[PDB]
Structure 1
Amino acid sequence: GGPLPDAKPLVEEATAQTKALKSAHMVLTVNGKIPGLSLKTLSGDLTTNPTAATGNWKLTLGGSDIDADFVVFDGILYATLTPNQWSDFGPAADIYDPAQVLNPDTGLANVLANFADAKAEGRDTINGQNTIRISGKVSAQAVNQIAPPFNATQPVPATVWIQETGDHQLAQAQLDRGSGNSVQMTLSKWGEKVQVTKPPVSKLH
Structure 2
Amino acid sequence: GPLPDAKPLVEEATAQTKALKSAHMVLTVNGKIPGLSLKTLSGDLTTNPTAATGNVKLTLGGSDIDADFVVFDGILYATLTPNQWSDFGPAADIYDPAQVLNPDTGLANVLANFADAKAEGRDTINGQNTIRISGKVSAQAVNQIAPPFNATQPVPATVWIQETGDHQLAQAQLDRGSGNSVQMTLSKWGEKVQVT
**TM value normalised by structure 2:** 0.98
Partner of 2:152: 153
Measured after TM superposition, the shift of residue 192 of structure 1 is: 0.6
C-alpha offsets along residues 27-46 of structure 1, whole Å, 9 cap, x if unaligned?
00000000110000000000
- Secondary structure, aligned partner of 1:56: strand
- Cα distance in 1 between the residues matched to 2:80 and 2:179: 31
CA contact (8 A) 2:99 2:145 kept: yes
CA contact (8 A) 1:46 1:194 kept: yes
CA contact (8 A) 2:65 2:80 kept: no
- Cα distance in 1 between the residues matched to 2:30 and 2:162: 24
- Cα distance in 2 between the residues matched to 1:150 and 1:109: 18
C-alpha offsets along residues 117-153 of structure 1, whole Å, 9 cap, x if unaligned?
0000011001000000000000000000111000001
Mapping for residues 67-146 of structure 1, pairs under 5 Å:
67-146=66-145
- Structure 1 runs (4+) deviating above 4 angstroms are none
- Cα distance in 2 between the residues matched to 1:156 and 1:56: 28
CA contact (8 A) 1:14 1:169 kept: yes
C-alpha offsets along residues 67-109 of structure 1, whole Å, 9 cap, x if unaligned?
0000000000000021111111100011000000000111000
1:42 lines up with 2:41 in the alignment = yes
After superposing the two structures, state which structure 1 stretch, 102-111 or 58-67, moved more. Answer: 58-67
Could you tell me the percent identity over the aligned residues? 99
- In our comparison, the structure showing a higher alpha carbon Rg is 1
- For structure 2, the 5+ residue unaligned runs are none
Measured after TM superposition, the shift of residue 3 of structure 1 is: 1.2
CA contact (8 A) 1:76 1:89 kept: yes
CA contact (8 A) 1:8 1:118 kept: yes
Number of matched pairs: 196
- Secondary structure, aligned partner of 1:178: coil
CA contact (8 A) 1:129 1:163 kept: yes
Measured after TM superposition, the shift of residue 196 of structure 1 is: 2.2
CA contact (8 A) 1:71 1:196 kept: no
**TM value normalised by structure 1:** 0.94
- For structure 1, the 5+ residue unaligned runs are 198-205
- Cα distance in 1 between the residues matched to 2:166 and 2:92: 31
Measured after TM superposition, the shift of residue 179 of structure 1 is: 1.0
> What root-mean-square deviation, in Å, do the aligned CA atoms of Structure 1 and Structure 2 show?
0.7
